[model samples]
Target: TITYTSQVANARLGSFSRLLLCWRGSIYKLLYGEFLIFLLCYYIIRFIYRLALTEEQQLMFEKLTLYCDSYIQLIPISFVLGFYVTLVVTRWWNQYENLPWPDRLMSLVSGFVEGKDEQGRLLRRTLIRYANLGNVLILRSVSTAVYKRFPSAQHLVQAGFMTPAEHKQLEKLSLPHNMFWVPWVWFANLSMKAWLGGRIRDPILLQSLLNEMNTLRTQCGHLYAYDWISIPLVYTQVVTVAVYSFFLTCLVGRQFLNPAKAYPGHELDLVVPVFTFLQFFFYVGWLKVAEQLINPFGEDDDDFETNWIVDRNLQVSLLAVDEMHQDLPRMEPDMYWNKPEPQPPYTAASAQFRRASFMGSTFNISLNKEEMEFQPN
Candidate 1:
């Protein structure tokens, strides 16, 4: 073991950097994978569209087609960046287990180093379950209020609207919507509309069926544009808050406190926390949460495998009560997984609740044995 660790530490992109890195890395991977899948489908659709078209349609299609070979080529570069990020996060997860994982893969990689309470004992598994549930509850509450207060980004996405340039970019991206949907959505759409060519032979009606496919194809494009443009808007919206608070104080009059002194918007704002650096560094944590949702034995209180946790509780409870060890009876088909009795939550709601009695304690009730013993009225 080495002695006396050097403390000549320096702060560079300190604090919020960690969170920024995590957010960007997550956004990058999700978009990258979905794009690749979409591109493959797009090309397949293009081929089919070409085959189905008449010679007259060729001229129309040619004019609309936009070649973007240069931009598409950058995908490989982004993927390389993603791989380097993966390697870095793996090493970090190995060194420190307590760090939160951005996705599922990192979860397993950092299992051992994650948990150590004040007494230096590995915390009880049940305690971990409750902790995760608690964190989700708290985060959800906070996020719900935040979304209500500032819903611009979400509103933009829900409207399925983007600028003309974004739509044009989608056009240039040239994913063959026709071939892609023919295999998946086109057939499904026809099935739903029951488009039998023989029964209703109006040419216009037949055309509308095909037109619906175009609408369906536009979905992926809308989502693609939404994700790209929406992320930047969301980031700016946050930066606006911080900058306006200190340097440009007047901006706060709309939602927050009044300005102490009006000044230029260029001034620096509040100092962020140290843990945020990991995210800004684009450092993904060790745990992969998608995988962990099935088994949340990870560090920190946010992995919730509900049914599994309940089973674990029963197992431990049995262990506590059993005076001598014996093989427990196995579960049977009729009994299924042998879940515990679900006790309803304690609330003011009661089968016998009355207006005057609703606020009182259960013990306050006075039950007459004679009335209780009487047959149902």
Candidate 2:
């Protein structure tokens, strides 16, 4: 989503430092609001202790600060936050992996669904369109950007992903369940028709087509399931409370008390609690990472570009099935036709990659001349 991949590709010196300077989708941008708020509260309490409190009040406040500081360590903020963030990140990646793409199905349609004629071309195009339509229908339900782009069935029709007749058919169905799978049903029916009509002469090819359709449908189902279920509310609540309350306690507990009174761990009344602020930045920023990725289909800066995916899938799938159907270059003998072990040419920059292949680890192992003789034990 926010690609700094190329910058860190070689791991040059200060590569990560360059990433730290980035503003968009960076930890600083996410944590600054909470950071400032924490600092403000810390400073306010510090000022009240230093300026407004009487000797007896100062003594009481110091006692409270020491008590809070000691007790805050028992919260286990690091352990809970670590596990919660790991779970959220894992789910986020799983959602991305399950997103459907039409490439495989489109290739099958192009190769198997015979005919370069108008009806054949139409059949090929329509089959892929149904696949793409089902993809969009599922994505729109889960992604805010996609829903904003195509809010209703009319938009789907207008976008050419759906036909008017198909829209009518979809509307005709009166069921309470989500109709995202409706277009997939259409795909199945149409593929069956193509098989019966001799357009798909091979039953095996048709079965492969159907198998791929099922695979795509299953991916769509996975995305929908991710949208429907979420990390347990109690887990999120526990992490949120742990992080916020830790900082809330830090506001009082981390105060720099009077040094003249010589309190333990408070010998120096440093005006700024630098370590506490850094802790706030790190711990809270970690929580923010979980927050942003918890629902990556949302309109966050790092969210998946679902709308772009929709457009690319439709354009590529249609092109593959229609324009690229039966399209080929003149077949000729390869440059390596006469050679048995043909090695492709590599540019100078990449020639370093031409090292010999690895043999077994024990390939070079040696023994004494006497030990080299193989004898039964």
Candidate 3:
């Protein structure tokens, strides 16, 4: 999810602060509802405690309030929220790291799969097509937006991920399990056949290609595993309960009472409960951060753009296999050929950072004659 990070990418100072005003996927958006609810509950309880209660009841309320205030330390909101959020973020990053990118496998296919004729071209294209097909299938399962784009078998066929004959083959092999691995299996079978028929040229190259496929297959399996097993419900439930329970306690425990009572910490009403508001902002915001990152395949602003990824993989793999196979630009001499020592010019804005080339740590050090001569002592 690319947030206002895009807006601040070029900023050294001035506009960096402007990122706070962004509304989408921001802490403000996450905290707004809870903040309002906390404020409403605080005022309502304060009003009823002041006006509705008789003098004896007010005295009882004060004692109960003081007791609740003292026991606020029992919840341990920060410690629990901090650990849970760290665990969630680590898991989120691991999931992202395992996301399948077909570049490595595609490069192998482009170089190793021998083909130049129309039939040869078709073979190469088909091989890469199946590779991308497998990737798209796994993505559709993991990501909501990709699933919505290709909701059915018909969509996958229509999007050129399958031919009608291949679609029939896929449909025929269907069991109750997910068919994401079917294309991957088909690709392996095709590679074996290609090796047997002499289209793949070298046995070692075939082994390399197969190894690359296995790597891709492993990545797909990991993504599937992540989708299957999430952070346990019990741990999430505990964190959820702890965070809300603390704030729920806050509604009573943090209310600013009349300083006229000469309560030890009740100095001023401050009307707005600024520090309490800040606390709620941070603690609730921490929980919301974990919630947003828990499943990154959803439509959160920070979530991966799976639809873009699907398109990019398909397009690039096809081009690499067909149009750009063995393609290279013409070689030419460089501008620095005549010059003995070369230094590239920088843009005016970047010129300030330019420095002389470093030689070594000891390059500039001077040695005395005795030191240079190597004393026997």
Question: Of the candidates shown, which would achieve the greatest TM-score relative to the real structure?
Answer: 2
lDDT of 3 by residue, 229-290 (tens): 99999989999998887877777878777788888787777767788788888888999999
TM per model? 0.20, 0.96, 0.90
Candidate 2 at 45: error in angstroms?
A: 1.7
Order of the predicted models by TM-score, top scorer first: 2, 3, 1
The prediction achieving the highest lDDT against the true structure is 2
Cα error of candidate 2 at position 32, Å = 1.5
Which scores higher on TM-score, 1 or 3?
A: 3
Model 2: per-residue Cα lDDT over 1-377, one tens digit each: 89888998997998898898888898988888878887788888988998999999999999999999987773489999889999999999999999999999999999999999999999999999999999999999999999999999899999998999999999998489889999888989999999999999988998999899999999999999999998999999999999888888888998988889888898997788889878888898889989999999998889999999999999999999999999988899999999999999999999998989789899889889999889989
> Mind giving the per-residue lDDT tens digits that candidate 1 earns over 73-97?
3233334334543543443333223
- Worst 10-residue lDDT window for candidate 2 reads 67-76
Q: lDDT per prediction? A: 0.31, 0.92, 0.84
Ranking by lDDT: 2, 3, 1
TM-score of 1: 0.20
